[PDB]
Design a binder for this molecule. Structure first.
Ligand SMILES: *[C@@H]1O[C@H](CO)[C@@H](O[C@@H]2O[C@H](CO)[C@@H](O[C@@H]3O[C@H](CO)[C@@H](O)[C@H](O[C@H]4O[C@H](CO)[C@@H](O)[C@H](O)[C@@H]4O)[C@@H]3O)[C@H](O)[C@H]2NC(C)=O)[C@H](O)[C@H]1NC(C)=O
Ligand SMILES: *[C@@H]1O[C@H](CO)[C@@H](O[C@@H]2O[C@H](CO)[C@@H](O[C@@H]3O[C@H](CO[C@H]4O[C@H](CO)[C@@H](O)[C@H](O)[C@@H]4O)[C@@H](O)[C@H](O)[C@@H]3O)[C@H](O)[C@H]2NC(C)=O)[C@H](O)[C@H]1NC(C)=O
Ligand SMILES: *[C@@H]1O[C@H](CO)[C@@H](O[C@@H]2O[C@H](CO)[C@@H](O[C@@H]3O[C@H](CO)[C@@H](O)[C@H](O)[C@@H]3O)[C@H](O)[C@H]2NC(C)=O)[C@H](O)[C@H]1NC(C)=O
Ligand SMILES: *[C@@H]1O[C@H](CO)[C@@H](O[C@@H]2O[C@H](CO)[C@@H](O[C@@H]3O[C@H](CO)[C@@H](O)[C@H](O)[C@@H]3O)[C@H](O)[C@H]2NC(C)=O)[C@H](O)[C@H]1NC(C)=O
Ligand SMILES: *[C@@H]1O[C@H](CO)[C@@H](O[C@@H]2O[C@H](CO)[C@@H](O[C@@H]3O[C@H](CO)[C@@H](O)[C@H](O)[C@@H]3O)[C@H](O)[C@H]2NC(C)=O)[C@H](O)[C@H]1NC(C)=O
Ligand SMILES: *[C@@H]1O[C@H](CO)[C@@H](O[C@@H]2O[C@H](CO)[C@@H](O[C@@H]3O[C@H](CO)[C@@H](O)[C@H](O)[C@@H]3O)[C@H](O)[C@H]2NC(C)=O)[C@H](O)[C@H]1NC(C)=O
Ligand SMILES: CCCCc1nc2c(N)nc3ccccc3c2n1CC(C)(C)O
Ligand SMILES: CCCCc1nc2c(N)nc3ccccc3c2n1CC(C)(C)O
Ligand SMILES: *[C@@H]1O[C@H](CO)[C@@H](O)[C@H](O)[C@H]1NC(C)=O
Ligand SMILES: *[C@@H]1O[C@H](CO)[C@@H](O)[C@H](O)[C@H]1NC(C)=O
Ligand SMILES: *[C@@H]1O[C@H](CO)[C@@H](O)[C@H](O)[C@H]1NC(C)=O
Ligand SMILES: *[C@@H]1O[C@H](CO)[C@@H](O)[C@H](O)[C@H]1NC(C)=O
Ligand SMILES: *[C@@H]1O[C@H](CO)[C@@H](O)[C@H](O)[C@H]1NC(C)=O
Ligand SMILES: *[C@@H]1O[C@H](CO)[C@@H](O)[C@H](O)[C@H]1NC(C)=O
Ligand SMILES: *[C@@H]1O[C@H](CO)[C@@H](O)[C@H](O)[C@H]1NC(C)=O
Ligand SMILES: *[C@@H]1O[C@H](CO)[C@@H](O)[C@H](O)[C@H]1NC(C)=O
Ligand SMILES: *[C@@H]1O[C@H](CO)[C@@H](O)[C@H](O)[C@H]1NC(C)=O
Lengths: 746, 740
């Protein structure tokens, strides 16, 4: 039949049963017997048993993370022992008190993150001689009630294929002895280890990663309960502790209260590539550090948040030895805290051939001598967000704890070239010299600078090749029709969240500049509360392909007593994508609709208040593939869609008030592959109501009398029409056979 | 049994509006006088409709049908002390024939009536107020309005006539001299002669606005007179309007104002001259000589297009406006205000409001405000100061009428409003030489400074400070403490720095204030503080903490914020709404102030609520738990409180009420259970005044009989919106109001 309650789907070619997040109270045994990998995460399962998977042994991989989704998960001894194929077991966030007993010797990956396991035992682990990755992090941390972690002596010795061990966010006090030398990655972050001896990593010649962050933490202003070493002292790492760590590429010493870095740590580390020294006390070492001479293959240096409490120095003080970091590509210096960036201050960085990212986020910087960036060899990313420049469980266990890892710049903007991010500063107006002597900036972010100026056509004269311009969340005054026109190569413009002046009827508003661009493809005017323009009422462009106009007031613009804005988007001759969501539309006048550009392939009018839609108007849009009408108040479909379109591929109608499907609504429009009727008021689906590929029906108040059998037997026949979330296609009616999926009835 | 579908009240109105009603409902009582059926689906009125209702003094059928109303020739005729009939927004193509002569008020606003006839109107000999406005305007498809000669002659008790937003072209002749108020705004009248206002000697208000409009940048379809010319008002046109108190000539394209216009208006009090071309008159202004009793003068939006002069130019003759209380000069547009510039206003004894909003002012010489006699409201919002149907037919069309300053702030004394400027940083001298400001608005100034306890030293008696929508860096434990008398502090929407984990955040200054009553910390994304984790005050009564991250502050692995509100020792109102809460750790709940009388935790994601903890809140009268995901009420509420008066549980997932009621909590007058998942109420006295139940999926089999009988019995237990307490089961009953 149609698989249930999981959604099968095949890949490499494995056969995954996505079965997560479904209010499942037990491993379903209708799981069906072809599945390898299954995912039962985020369900209400509270027991596991040798029964649970008793007829399923092609399973390479099981994910039971986050069960039950609030007791704990109760897993009996040997439960999994019969799965001889089982390579990957994920058991995160299950409130386990122990490593389950009698796990299969086949396991290569075992995750036990975010439980209550305080004992690491031979009996739990030592039989798992095929383990490559073992995750035991986040069992005892912060102000959780938990025990010190007891690691049986030698427990890791038999694991001679162990490559990744993670024990972070456990109370360990010492690095465990008897680590197998197969290890490539060892994570010991936040484990309350004060001291690293010579002996602790002696044998680990294969190690490429070592993480000792958060041992002797810097606790000032911590966003979590933080226990420093006595007197807030430094971690203590024996001079010889890394002497055989010859293969190390990654070394994380964040928040280890370091004031000094022992250059000898790096003697026998010729491959070190990433060094993380955030949240320490290294302003001295940054000015004067001899370790900078030991790292000719380093590519990423993170020295963020090394500020001294009570100091806002004039300038940043970079050692001349920075010039020896020949391989350096990214330098992170957020939160050093200083007032002013001078050209001379960064001289030591200027001849590094590969330095493409400089990160100065969050430094309370007031002035920058911008011309210094030109004198670098090869800067691609100049990141100055969140400064003071002016004119002119809460933590994800699978992510970096000490900073976000999202790119500094959106890839869509960075793709165009050199990027300068000055977002979240106080450049509240751009004077004639603001951008003098910058490199050829292609991507510029001026978001959240509370800019209130009248852009006039001259402000970006010195960086006239910007291709992607972010001016979101300012308060721009559009009084001048020449605004931004000096940017001939402009392709993407984001003017979102500039409501300030748009809201005021009494002031002028001029959007004429849009037409002057010959290369403009994407324009976002969202959340601007646009409701009146001055003189020219129409948006015009031969180029534009995408216009986002959500969060404006087309309800006023297209008011019944006003003809002025009736052709507002018609002049966008190239438009394929239009977004009119969140415009408080109760209806669209037929004439306004008919003046939407005939080029559209994609139209969103979701999250308005439409009670009626004139389906017949779709005749004037022969290219239209996607029509999105979700989150309105629509009552009525049409029985003759196929007269009105032969292009429509996707029709999205969730969150409306549709109670009937018309006979032959659907069956005639053979372009239509995806129909979404979820969260409507449908009691039933008549026989009459097949080129359809996906049909969504969840959250409709179905009647489960015998007149639903029409539908069921259809479902049975068209097994290649994906119906998602069958678990949420539920009977509201009658008393029985109620509450249960329509798919389980006689 | 129980009133339906209307809702009655004493002081006798039958609130029957907005109900999906398709016709007038027959079930309505003789005692009822005022029927309000506005916003319904009603499409037909006849003499049947109001058969036997008799006693109505007032009917409202505005907005019917809610996407024309067909009214028959004598429908209202029989009830003959009907004084007020309201028929707005009904797409009437005509005035209804055969209206009772009892009418003192008729409103036909927002219809399609283009013919005003004797046949319709002249019988209505008792009309005092007649509204015919907004029948033909803008780009509406409509006709010039035909006013049958002398139609208003017979109405000798007519006091108010409104014909605005109709194409008239001429003031109609033969108006009754009984008139007090004549509204002719936006009527396309180009010409006002001596003969139009005859006398009309009792007129107190005349509105000629929007005739010959100033159309530049108009927010509606605007048609000017030829070449954008001025309305033409004969020098003697108002010579017999001796009683006039209100004159509205906004948007009539005036470049000149004739002093003679005012010679015979010795009582003129409000003069509205907005959206004209009066910069020249403002500078030279001989008419200012003729208005010794004028109290409000609005000269807003008289800017010269494309002109941004250095200074504003105010005639010396403004010194003759001896009764002036409020002067509105928005939208003149000028760069700088200097002390000289306002000399002519400075000896005016009663000038309390000066409104300079929306002028793109870049600098003000602030000491000038001191030299005025007695300013109470100094309104400089929306400038560029830096560190030193769409229109409601019942409101003003040319400007908002809300107060300039919130009454709660202005009530403390002298007000200075500098909101929406660019005072991004307050320097030591910013507030020198100001008067004794009690109410200060600095909202939306992009302010990112670290307030330090010295910024308001020159105005140390501020009692109500609005710092909302800035980007304040809260990095100093002494911030704002120089304001000893401060009672109301609004810090909403200062997210910028709070949301950054790695910068420091300091809210300790709170405890310093001895008179602080109300503090608003809403929409700040507060989730981590530096060193001091607790909010403390002996004085504070109300804390708004909505739109922060208590979900994080009270995270299970963190004990630091577990007492965060405990030190607010005098707190009685607390708002914890919109904090993304799934559960509150019992210990965190028990540390809320025991002084609480009102607690809001609405619009979180609560799955569970520990009812027994209410034992520690003996003063608690309101508990608001709306918009969560709660499943289960307790059956022993009465063990956990004897104080609770209001319990709000709308929009949760409750599907069963336990016996007895929940309990019998004898203090409980108001229970809201609307929009839950309730199938039934079975058995099973109360002290409830009100039970809300609308929007639960009721089963309408014979088991719902239990509850009905209860309803029949406890008739003084108000159950609102019975139209919306409907069955979702079974099919045949489903749709219907349980009560039938
Ligand atoms: C100290 O420094 C080291 C850097 O050397 C840092 O090691 C990195 O840790 C993170 C885990 O915190 C690793 O990132 C993960 O890698 C795995 C395997 O490749 C991925 O599956 C993860 O991606 C999934 O989960 C992400 C987060 O939920 C999702 O965003 C994503 O879409 C996936 O579903 C994730 O990328 C990273 O591999 C290591 N680095 C190396 C080189 O091994 C360590 O975390 C730092 N210590 C602390 C406490 O911050
Ligand atoms: C020209 O200037 C004239 C004199 O200033 C303006 O005259 C005023 O006209 C207004 C608008 O009609 C009258 O408005 C008052 O407002 C209340 C509102 O009552 C109900 O409706 C509003 C809906 O907003 C609601 O807010 C309330 O709470 C009520 O539900 C009326 O009920 C009042 O009686 C009155 O209508 C003023 O009365 C009137 N002033 C005087 C002195 O009569 C005129 O509007 C200006 N012309 C234009 C086109 O703007
Ligand atoms: C210009 O700078 C602004 C401000 O730094 C950048 O805004 C940031 O943009 C990222 C999105 O790429 C935001 O992260 C996202 O936030 C949303 C909201 O919860 C979340 O749903 C996404 O998954 C993601 O986490 C971040 O919120 C936002 N920051 C602020 C303060 O608004 C913007 O991207 C920059 N522009 C370019 C072109 O790089
Ligand atoms: C202003 O509107 C623009 C254009 O819609 C927004 O930028 C666009 O953001 C969407 C994400 O919502 C991007 O979609 C893409 O989706 C796929 C995966 O589903 C992925 O390949 C991409 O990484 C991206 O997520 C689209 O690329 C992006 N377009 C551009 C030109 O950047 C923008 O976010 C809106 N601004 C604000 C403040 O909302
Ligand atoms: C300080 O200045 C700010 C900005 O001028 C004032 O904010 C403004 O407050 C008004 C009046 O409360 C807001 O309008 C109101 O809006 C609600 C619904 O959104 C409506 O129910 C009311 O009828 C009313 O018109 C207005 O949005 C707001 N402006 C902005 C930009 O937020 C603030 O009240 C002033 N504070 C004091 C103490 O006077
Ligand atoms: C920040 O929080 C305070 C909330 O305490 C807000 O001011 C308060 O706003 C409420 C209305 O939500 C006011 O109550 C109302 O006042 C009048 C009584 O004159 C009445 O018409 C209403 O039924 C209601 O009682 C309360 O007076 C007012 N308190 C003060 C001190 O002004 C403020 O609006 C919030 N700020 C923001 C930006 O949301
Ligand atoms: C990277 C920031 C570390 C701590 C800190 N928070 C702030 C803050 N909120 N505002 C400032 C304003 C001016 C200068 C510094 C800060 C600041 N800092 C850095 C220190 C603790 C050195 O004041
Ligand atoms: C009361 C404003 C009338 C028309 C107008 N809109 C604006 C505007 N958006 N920005 C300005 C910035 C500096 C100076 C004037 C304006 C402005 N004005 C006034 C005119 C059209 C004369 O420029
Ligand atoms: C610089 O980077 C490039 C990789 O793009 C590499 O080819 C070259 O070896 C690097 N040079 C140095 C000195 O590291
Ligand atoms: C825009 O500003 C430019 C440069 O100041 C000015 O010369 C021009 O007249 C303004 N343009 C308009 C109003 O189109
Ligand atoms: C229309 O858009 C396409 C796709 O971006 C673009 O290549 C083409 O040049 C555009 N046409 C015009 C007239 O700009
Ligand atoms: C929809 O548009 C059609 C065809 O253009 C028009 O004739 C018809 O009146 C409209 N239908 C509705 C319900 O408005
Ligand atoms: C004012 O009008 C009355 C008629 O209502 C008239 O008697 C009187 O002469 C007029 N006063 C003048 C024109 O000054
Ligand atoms: C000023 O206002 C007071 C209070 O209303 C009033 O009694 C007095 O007559 C006024 N003075 C003038 C010149 O109008
Ligand atoms: C607050 O700010 C002022 C000025 O920086 C300073 O004198 C005072 O010491 C500050 N207090 C704290 C706690 O930083
Ligand atoms: C507590 O609040 C009341 C009511 O506002 C106030 O009268 C009293 O002074 C406050 N107590 C303290 C200690 O501030
Ligand atoms: C409610 O809180 C009390 C503490 O007074 C505790 O004993 C009880 O376990 C709690 N009940 C639930 C269901 O959390």
């Amino acid at each position: 039949s149609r698989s249930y309650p999981c959604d099968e789907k095949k890949q490499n070619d494995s056969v995954i049963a996505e079965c997560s997040n479904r209010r499942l109270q037990e491993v379903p045994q209708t799981v069906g017997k072809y599945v390898t990998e299954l995912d039962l995460s985020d369900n209400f399962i509270t027991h596991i048993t040798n029964e649970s998977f008793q007829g399923l042994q092609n399973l390479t991989k099981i994910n039971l993370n986050h069960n039950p989704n609030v007791n704990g998960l109760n897993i009996t001894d040997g439960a999994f022992l019969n799965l001889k194929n089982l390579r990957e077991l994920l058991l995160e966030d299950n409130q386990l008190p122990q490593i389950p007993s009698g796990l299969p010797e086949s396991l290569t990956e075992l995750s036990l993150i975010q439980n209550n396991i305080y004992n690491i035992t031979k009996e739990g682990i030592s039989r798992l001689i095929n383990l490559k990755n073992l995750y035991l992090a986040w069992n005892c941390y912060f102000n959780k009630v938990c025990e010190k972690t007891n690691i049986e002596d030698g427990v890791f010795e038999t694991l001679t294929n162990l490559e990744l061990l993670s024990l972070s966010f456990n109370s360990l006090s010492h690095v465990p002895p008897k680590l197998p030398s197969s290890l490539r990655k060892l994570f010991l972050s936040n484990t309350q280890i004060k001291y690293i001896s010579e002996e602790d990593f002696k044998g680990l010649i294969n190690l490429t990663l070592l993480d000792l962050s958060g041992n002797c933490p810097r606790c000032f202003n911590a966003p979590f309960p933080c226990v420093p070493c006595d007197g807030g002292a430094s971690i203590n790492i024996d001079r010889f502790a890394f002497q055989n760590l010859t293969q190390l590429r990654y070394l994380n010493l964040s928040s280890t209260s370091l004031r000094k870095i022992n250059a000898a740590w790096f003697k026998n580390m010729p491959h070190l590539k990433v060094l993380d020294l955030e949240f320490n006390y290294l302003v001295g070492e940054i000015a004067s550090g001899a370790f900078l001479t030991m790292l000719p293959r380093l590519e990423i240096l993170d020295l963020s948040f090394n500020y001294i409490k009570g100091s806002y120095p004039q300038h940043i003080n970079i050692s001349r030895n920075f010039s020896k970091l020949l391989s350096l590509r990214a330098l992170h210096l957020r939160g050093y805290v200083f007032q002013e960036l001078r050209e001379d201050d960064f001289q030591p960085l200027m001849q590094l051939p590969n330095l493409s990212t400089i990160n100065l986020g969050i430094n309370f910087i007031k002035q920058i001598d911008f011309k210094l960036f030109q004198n670098f060899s090869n800067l691609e990313i100049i990141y100055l967000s969140e400064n003071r420049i002016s004119p002119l469980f809460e933590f994800d266990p699978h992510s970096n704890f000490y900073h976000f890892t999202r790119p500094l710049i959106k890839p869509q903007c960075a793709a165009y070239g050199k990027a300068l991010d000055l977002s979240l500063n106080s450049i509240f107006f751009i004077g004639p010299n603001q951008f003098e002597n910058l490199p050829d900036i292609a991507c510029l972010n001026l978001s959240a600078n509370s800019n209130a100026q009248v852009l006039s056509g001259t402000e970006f004269s010195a960086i006239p090749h910007v291709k992607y311009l972010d001016l979101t969340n300012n308060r721009l005054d559009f009084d001048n029709a020449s605004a931004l026109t000096e940017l001939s190569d402009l392709e993407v413009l984001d003017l979102s969240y500039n409501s300030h002046y748009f809201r005021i009827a009494g002031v002028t508003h001029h959007l004429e500049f849009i037409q002057n661009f010959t290369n403009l493809k994407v324009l976002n005017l969202s959340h601007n509360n646009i409701y009146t323009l001055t003189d020219k009422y129409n948006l015009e462009s031969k180029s534009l392909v995408e216009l986002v106009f959500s969060g404006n007031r087309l309800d006023i613009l297209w008011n019944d007593d006003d003809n002025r804005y009736i052709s507002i988007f018609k002049g966008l001759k190239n438009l394929t994508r239009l977004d009119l969501s969140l415009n408080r539309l109760k209806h669209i006048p037929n004439e306004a609709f008919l003046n939407l550009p005939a080029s559209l392939t994609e139209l969103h009018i979701n999250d308005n208040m439409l009670k009626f839609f004139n389906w017949t108007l779709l005749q004037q849009f022969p290219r239209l593939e996607l029509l999105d009408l979700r989150g309105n108040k629509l009552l009525f479909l049409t029985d003759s869609l196929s007269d009105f379109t032969s292009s429509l591929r996707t029709l999205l109608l969730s969150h409306n008030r549709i109670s009937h499907l018309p006979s032959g609504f659907l069956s005639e429009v053979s372009s239509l592959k995806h129909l979404d009727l979820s969260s409507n008021l449908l009691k039933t689906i008549n026989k009459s109501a097949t080129k359809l590929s996906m049909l969504e029906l969840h959250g409709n108040p179905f009647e489960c009398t015998c007149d639903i059998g029409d539908f069921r037997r259809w479902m049975d026949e068209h097994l290649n029409v994906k119906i998602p979330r069958l678990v949420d296609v539920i009977c509201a009616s009658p008393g029985d056979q109620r509450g249960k999926s329509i798919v389980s009835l006689e």
